[PDB]
């Protein structure tokens with residue numbers, strides 16, 4: 001797929017808003033993922049003892065991991081689809097070490113969109129939502145192609 005120059009502009013405009021509070025966004029996104037799809041929590045040995053939202057919000061290490069996730073995702077989005085070199089280390093760890101199906105990437109894409117609405121109620125319209133969905137779909141499609149390049153069925 002291909003985004004218009006105007007769609008990338010929208011994605012990068014919304015991402016500047018994330019970059020102003022990376023830790024807050026990343027913490028909310030992982031908690032939403034875990035509450036919506038508790039099976040994903042079992043993939044995190046360090047976090048699977050957390051059982052309630054209130055324990056999750058008090059974990060400093062969960063927040064740190066949020067920053068890690070969004071920092072990587074931001075570097076990719078800023079490439080406006082010219083991201084092959086950034087995807088390779090990511091596909092490698094997620095396919096071969098963590099053993100994350102592409103389905104779980106759809107789940108965290110849903111959590112990102114939900115948290116962007118929850119944190120930016122008047123700043124994230126249908127046009128920006130559509131552009132971000134396209135950019136995240138482009139990401140998931142290209143990382144599924146990198147899983148296959150590595151010999152895995154995501």
Ligand code: HEM
Nearest residue numbers: 040043044046068069072073090093094098100104105108
């Ligand atoms: C936007 C999608 C994602 C991005 C950019 C991302 C990025 C990262 C990065 C940068 C790391 C640390 C380095 C590494 O191991 O590669 C990491 C670790 C990890 N990721 Fe992801 N990730 C994503 C989605 C997911 C999902 C949906 C899952 C599981 C449900 C997952 C499972 C894990 C696990 C288990 C680790 C190791 C955690 C630990 O340190 O204990 N990732 N991820």
